[PDB]
Amino acid sequence: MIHELLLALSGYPGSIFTWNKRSGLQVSQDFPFLHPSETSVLNRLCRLGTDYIRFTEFIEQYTGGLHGIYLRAFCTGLDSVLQPYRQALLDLEQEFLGDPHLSISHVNYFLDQFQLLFPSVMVVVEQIKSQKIHGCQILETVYKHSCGGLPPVRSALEKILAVCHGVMYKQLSAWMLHGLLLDQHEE
Amino acid sequence: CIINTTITLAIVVDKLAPRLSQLKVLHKVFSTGVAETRNVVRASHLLNTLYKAILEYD
C-alpha cells in the first residue's frame, strides 16, 4: 500500500485495491488495522488509478478505433501526454527507496497535479466515444476544449491537436501535391 | 548492467517499450503468413500482405 499503491497506480491491480469494472480501483473498506480516514485518502488516490487503467485499456483496445487513422493519431498523442504521470511515479519509487517511512500526504501532494489533468481529458475521450466522432471532427472536438482554462489542460490538449494535425497535413501533402487522395473511410 | 545501479520490473518494462511496440506488429503480420497449400499461393499471399500492411502505416 506503499508499494502496492504505486503498483495499482501503475495500472496493475491487486486484491487490496480490488479492480472492479464498475467501481474501478476499490478498497474493500473493512480492515481492522487501518481505519476510515486513510481509506478516504486511498479512495481519492484510486480515482487517478481508475482513470489510468481506463486510459490504458482504451489505448490498448483502440490504437484503429472501430477501424482507422485519425483516432489512431489521438491515442499516439494520448500515451505521450500521460507519460509524466509514469515518470513522476518512478520518481516516487526512488524517494521511497531513499527513506523508509514517507506518508500518503507526501504522495498526495506530489500527485495532486495529475489529480486535475486526468478527469479533464476523460471528457475529451468520452465525447469521441459517445457521438461516434468520425475522422476530422475529432480535430474540432479537441479544439473546442483547447479553449480550456486550466493552463496545464490547455497545453496537454494542444500537444494532441499538434500530433493529429500531423496526419491531416500528411494527407493534404498527398492530394495538394501529387493529386491523389489516400483515404479509406476516413476523410 | 544487472551483474555489474538499481533495476526493477517497472524500469525494465519502460526501457523495453519501443521494442514491445514493434513486436506486436510482428504478431499481426506473421499471423497472415502462418494461417495459409500450393507453393505459389502461400508465397504470393505472404508477399502481398506486406505491401498492404505498410500502406496501412503511411
Binding site: 527507496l97 523508509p100 | 545501479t5 538499481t6 526493477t8
Partner: peptide, 23 residues
C-alpha cells in the same frame, strides 16, 4: 580522520529486498 575516510568511493547498488542500509 573519519571525515577523511568519509570522502571514499561509494557503491551505488540497491535491491528491493534490501531497503535499510543496503550499499
Amino acid at each position: 580522520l573519519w571525515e577523511a575516510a568519509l570522502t571514499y568511493e561509494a557503491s551505488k547498488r540497491r535491491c528491493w529486498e534490501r531497503v535499510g542500509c543496503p550499499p
